[PDB]
RNA sequence: UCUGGGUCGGGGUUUCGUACGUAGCAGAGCAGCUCCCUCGCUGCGAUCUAUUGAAAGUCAGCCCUCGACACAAGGGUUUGU
RNA sequence: GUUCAUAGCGACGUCGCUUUUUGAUCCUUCGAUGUCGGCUCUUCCUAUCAUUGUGAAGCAGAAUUCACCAAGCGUUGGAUUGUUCACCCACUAAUAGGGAACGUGAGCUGGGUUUAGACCGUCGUGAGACAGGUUAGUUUUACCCUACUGAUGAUGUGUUGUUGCCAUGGUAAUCCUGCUCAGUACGAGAGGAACCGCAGGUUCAGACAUUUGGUGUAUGUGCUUGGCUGAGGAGCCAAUGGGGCGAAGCUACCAUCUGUGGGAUUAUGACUGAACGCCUCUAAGUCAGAAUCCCGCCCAGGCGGAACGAUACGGCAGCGCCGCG
RNA sequence: UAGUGACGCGCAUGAAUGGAUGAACGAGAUUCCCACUGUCCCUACCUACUAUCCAGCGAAACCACAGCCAAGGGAACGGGCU
RNA sequence: AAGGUGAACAGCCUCUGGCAUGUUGGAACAAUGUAGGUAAGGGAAGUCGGCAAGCCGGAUCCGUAACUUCGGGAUAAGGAU
RNA sequence: AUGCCUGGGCAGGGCGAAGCCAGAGGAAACUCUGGUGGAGGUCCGUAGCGGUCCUGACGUGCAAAUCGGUCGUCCGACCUG
């Protein structure tokens, strides 16, 4: 029912975010962003709570060298809320997810943005702190 | 309209202005402007900076 | 050969006479179609842009994620002092177009309106409408005026009113008032002409023409930017750094076989100072100007039922590069074309405004008053004094 | 001639962050004098404290001044149904 | 193709269309038309990938291919290769095919063809040859005319000013997701819609700085290295000395606001209705009909008009209406 | 289709027309990683010197005549012809 | 072949000495440029190719691998002041 | 371009070879530790010499081959009258 209410996105294709779940992965190199038509020479950009495809550049060999769906939780780029507050989380952090939205891990380290929490209920359920 | 207090200076932050910073350790700060934001990010202690409300309280200025 | 990777063109082909506007005041290219059932009413007004600020309010759109939540919107202030009606004009529809039939001016005309008819006011002797006002003080002139009004009633199809702004009540340097034709939409031509004649030499406030929570159109000249390159004028792609003969230029203009440059090619030239007509601007608040009963009444400008303060829309130190707003003002959602001090034309919407977002009622909760001349942090000087305490300059 | 604009000055706002000087029983300490007294006196001494949210800038493309100054029908080229 | 030629195909034969491939000729150019790609940019074509409107099934829904009006709007980001071409990864409604001197070098790059220096393999006694590979190898000139983007302007309206009209040109918006319908219609089950509504987003267009960010030589205010005014103070030099914060102004889907309605109809589905005592959307006549076309919204405004104001008191003047010479 | 390690079936590798190896070195040619950044996403702002205007001084290339387009034919892509 | 900083005949500032900024000046600070810079988030995703720019940079104290012709690599790499 | 004769010139730093001194171990052969020494067609680097890259500026130029940054070498097969 609730809309996305687009915000500033600062995670283009090639950004290496840190994994924030107990799956075992350390880094997540973003290879593309879902739901983007695209434009000429315009790199796809991912914001908070955006479904992306990533690859584990560092971590367990089982998770390395394969594509995983993921959801961006925190971004260092400041985004504006609907009530006029600009928020940034000091780091770019994401969690590995499947197609239906179920997290592959069991816990999330650090805060989780309210946009991602509202968009993905399971990530909100596993979230420790909100925004 | 919930008016916040600046985590560094202490001035009231109206909804239109200010900035919000959520650190990874799990706590949130409100900054009145980029000056206070940079002062906080540079690890400067607010009690040693004269214009800060904490400095004024510490030195018992006014009243 | 063909273009490998398709991409949309840069700029709009329907907006590219890229010339400085011949006119400075916004022209109403099309007035609303008059239905001969509603009462008579003016369809336009002339204001002056002052500045922008914040607004805080609760939205009432069910189903949205932000429903019943506090939101902030950028609002633009347009100072709109009441305008003086000084003349009327009739238009008759012809197979060639819409020809002006008869123009009748009032007896007494203010010097602000008289200034417009003279390029140089200091040098001139101010002789405009000297023998014309004699028609209002003679029996033959009165008979001629009555005959002209009867002819306009019989023949004219469209009736417009000449109204000029009051430049005295503004902080702007200039004193030359802006005149404008406003088409009257309402009942029959006879009743419309009678109302226009009655409104002669009279003030018109903004409450008569526009109301709260209304969608209107803003017409004005873009803030000029002078000669600009293609990279800024059409936002074309920048050439790589290795380019020899410049990089902020369009690389390929056209093909070989057509030995001419097409009008659709992005070229360097004038950017800004373009006539524009923004539509669907929402009136958040029509604020009353300064009035005196025993003392100054400045609360009516910015005080709300939830703030109940003594603040006016003027921030600390006044609006930057405009002045202090003391007259009636209109607060519009979002930004409007033009720079500060710029005259803008407010026009009633040309479309049936029946939409979920266009019919929403606006109830303000907080109006920002922090100084815009930097990073302001105090809403009012009283609050600033209370927070700071006594200073050395006391 | 809605008397107007200009210069200066005063406030409002805003930017930076606490001015020179003075005083201190603050100050890692050190030296001289001698009433060898080492909280005795006199000096050097990063810095600190009160004066002091002080000092400094602020329209040249920010707002009010109606506070002081001079000036403001004057200069040249024109066009006729 | 379970039955069945024409739902979708189609052998043995046969008729055509295109110059987006290679061919044949040498017609223009050897007193020189700069020889591949890639980047940027504009326009055009339909042999339609997707979106709008429909006809079709071996169309129950979903999915689907076949055909029609249809080029308005879209046709992406990357690993490899100089590559066109080619393959793979991911997203997406789709990643459809092409032309414009195989568009585009006084626009750019020079990566490899294609000078001169060299290395390797084959051939030749040899100098040398290799659509056999590798490396380094100067990309000149616009101030001329036209075209285009902007800017003064120009002939008429007796002169100027005013508010306006309009012929003409340009034109703009596009697509998708979530909730409800609905786990409903349909279907043995698995599966699984559609219309109207609500919230919004992709690309594009026009603006603007209240907020966030950027710039910052107000060289605004502190802090500092070297040196120089004897020192304190106040300063300056070191092509902007360096480094914090930073007013105003410009600026970023890196912030914010807005983006519209009618008419005629195409394909198609129909009404009445003979030709053809029956039947028929067609022969007369009539209805519905869309990203189509045109107009409206919007930009400019014609060797085009509009009514209105003042029209040279002068120290010499100069004009406007009337009448009869 | 690049880089590295193994296989030999080597159009046409190969032993002073020298084969293999090789510490150090190379303004020699390539592949990958760390950090770094406007190469880019996506451009924006500031400074100096020009470009702009003015006073003075002041050239050169080029020039059949000159310069608005659609189609046709032509010597097979016209500013002139229809 | 002066003084200061400095390892230094490095760069920068100053004294003796030399000069008018290098075949002209004035007014604004438009677009293209030439030479310098700065940029939120990503960090080579651009491009034939990290082209260009940027990063590290002095000194003191620790530490320093593979290989090797045992000489080197080496200021290896990486840390603190 | 090369050979010869006769003259001139080449800051400041890093690595620390032969040789030597002292201490410790050894039964000898001799070996380890701390110093001294400054050799090298040695390394960073100025003057000098040359011209990689930006295929930068200019390209009817300052110049019929110049300028900026970045560059190789700089005690010897060095540069030069």
Swiss-Prot record, chain A:
Q: What SMART domains does the database record attribute to this sequence?
A: Ribosomal_L14
Q: Which GO terms describe its biological process?
A: translation
Pfam families membership: Ribosomal_L14 (PF00238)
Q: What exactly does this protein do?
A: Component of the large ribosomal subunit. The ribosome is a large ribonucleoprotein complex responsible for the synthesis of proteins in the cell.
Query: Which HAMAP family does the annotation name?
Result: Ribosomal_uL14
In the record, the note on similarity to other proteins reads: Belongs to the universal ribosomal protein uL14 family.
Q: What is this protein called?
A: Large ribosomal subunit protein uL14
Curated annotation (Swiss-Prot), chain B:
Which residues in this protein are found as N6-acetyllysine? Answer: 27
Q: Which domain of life is it from?
A: Eukaryota
Please list the residues that carry the modification ADP-ribosyl glutamic acid. 4
Say where the cross-link Glycyl lysine isopeptide (Lys-Gly) (interchain with G-Cter in SUMO2) occurs.
Answer: 2, 27, 35
Which segments does the entry list as coiled coil?
none
Compartment(s) of residence: Cytoplasm
Could you state what the record's PTM comment says about this protein? Mono-ADP-ribosylation at Glu-4 by PARP16 inhibits polysome assembly and mRNA loading, thereby inhibiting protein translation.
The record's subunit annotation is: Component of the large ribosomal subunit.
Entry's family note: Belongs to the eukaryotic ribosomal protein eL24 family.
Tell me the function of this protein. Component of the large ribosomal subunit. The ribosome is a large ribonucleoprotein complex responsible for the synthesis of proteins in the cell.
Name the chain's protein.
Answer: Large ribosomal subunit protein eL24
| Shown segment, full-protein numbering | 1 to 63 of 157
From Swiss-Prot, chain C:
Subcellular location as annotated: Nucleus, Nucleolus; Cytoplasm
One biological process GO term for this chain?
A: translation
GO MF, one annotated term: structural constituent of ribosome
Comp. bias (Basic residues): 17-30
Task: Report the residues modified as N6-acetyllysine.
Answer: 135, 285, 293, 365, 372
Q: Which GO terms describe its cellular component?
A: cytosolic large ribosomal subunit; nucleolus
Q: Does the keyword Ribonucleoprotein apply?
A: yes
Residues found modified as Tele-methylhistidine: 244
Modified positions (Phosphoserine) are: 12, 303
Specify the protein name. Answer: Large ribosomal subunit protein uL3
Q: Which organism is it from?
A: Oryctolagus cuniculus
């Amino acid at each position: 029912s609730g809309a996305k209410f687009r915000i500033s996105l600062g995670l283009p294709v090639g950004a290496v975010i840190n994994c924030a779940d107990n799956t075992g992965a350390k880094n997540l190199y973003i290879i593309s962003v879902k739901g983007i038509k695209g434009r000429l020479n315009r790199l796809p950009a991912a914001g908070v709570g955006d479904m992306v495809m990533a690859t584990v550049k560092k971590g367990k060999p089982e998770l390395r060298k394969k594509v995983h769906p993921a959801v961006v939780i925190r971004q260092r780029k400041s985004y504006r809320r609907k009530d006029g507050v600009f928020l940034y989380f000091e780091d770019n952090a994401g969690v590995i997810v499947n197609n239906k939205g179920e997290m592959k891990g069991s816990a999330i380290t650090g805060p989780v943005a309210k946009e991602c929490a509202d968009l993905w209920p399971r990530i909100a359920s596993n979230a420790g702190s909100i925004a | 309209m919930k008016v916040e207090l600046c985590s560094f200076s202490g001035y009231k932050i109206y909804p239109g202005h200010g900035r919000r910073y959520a650190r990874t350790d799990g706590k949130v700060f409100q900054f009145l402007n980029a000056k206070c934001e940079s002062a906080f990010l540079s690890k400067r202690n607010p009690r040693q900076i004269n214009w800060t409300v904490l400095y004024r309280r510490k030195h018992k200025k006014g009243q | 050969s063909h273009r490998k990777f398709s991409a949309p063109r840069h700029g709009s082909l329907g907006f590219l006479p890229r010339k400085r506007s011949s006119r400075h005041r916004g022209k109403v290219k099309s007035f609303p179609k008059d239905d001969p059932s509603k009462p008579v009413h003016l369809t336009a007004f002339l204001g002056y842009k002052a500045g922008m600020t914040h607004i805080v309010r609760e939205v009432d759109r069910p189903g949205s994620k932000v429903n019943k939540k506090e939101v902030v919107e950028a609002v633009t202030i347009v100072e709109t002092p009441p305008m003086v009606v000084v003349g009327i004009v009739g238009y008759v529809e012809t197979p060639r177009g819409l020809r002006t039939f008869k123009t009748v001016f009032a007896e007494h005309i203010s010097d602000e309106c008289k200034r417009r008819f003279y390029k140089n006011w200091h040098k001139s002797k101010k002789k405009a409408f000297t023998k014309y006002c004699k028609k209002w003080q003679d029996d033959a002139g009165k008979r001629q005026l009555d005959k002209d009004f009867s002819s306009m009633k019989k023949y004219c199809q469209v009736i417009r009113v000449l109204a000029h702004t009051q430049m005295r009540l503004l902080p702007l340097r200039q004193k030359k008032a802006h005149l404008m034709e406003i088409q009257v939409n309402g009942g029959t031509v006879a009743e419309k002409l009678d109302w226009a004649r009655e409104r002669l030499e009279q003030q018109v406030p903004v409450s008569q023409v526009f109301g709260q929570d209304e969608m209107i159109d803003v017409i004005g000249v873009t803030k000029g930017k002078g000669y600009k390159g293609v990279t800024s004028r059409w936002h074309t792609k920048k050439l790589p750094r290795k380019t020899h003969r410049g990089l902020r230029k369009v690389a390929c203009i056209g093909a070989w076989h057509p030995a001419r440059v097409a009008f659709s090619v992005a070229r360097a030239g004038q950017k800004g100072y373009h006539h524009r007509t923004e539509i669907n601007k929402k009136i958040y608040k029509i604020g009353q100007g300064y009035l005196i009963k025993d003392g100054k009444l400045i609360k009516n400008n910015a005080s709300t039922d939830y703030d109940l303060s003594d603040k006016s829309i003027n921030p600390l130190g006044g609006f930057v590069h405009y002045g202090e707003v003391t007259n009636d003002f209109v607060m519009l959602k979002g930004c409007v074309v033009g720079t500060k001090k710029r005259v803008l034309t407010l026009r009633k919407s040309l479309l049936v405004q029946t939409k979920r977002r266009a019919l929403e009622k606006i109830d303000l909760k907080f109006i920002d008053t922090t100084s815009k001349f930097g990073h302001g942090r105090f809403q009012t000087v009283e609050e600033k004094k209370a927070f700071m305490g006594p200073l050395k300059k006391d």
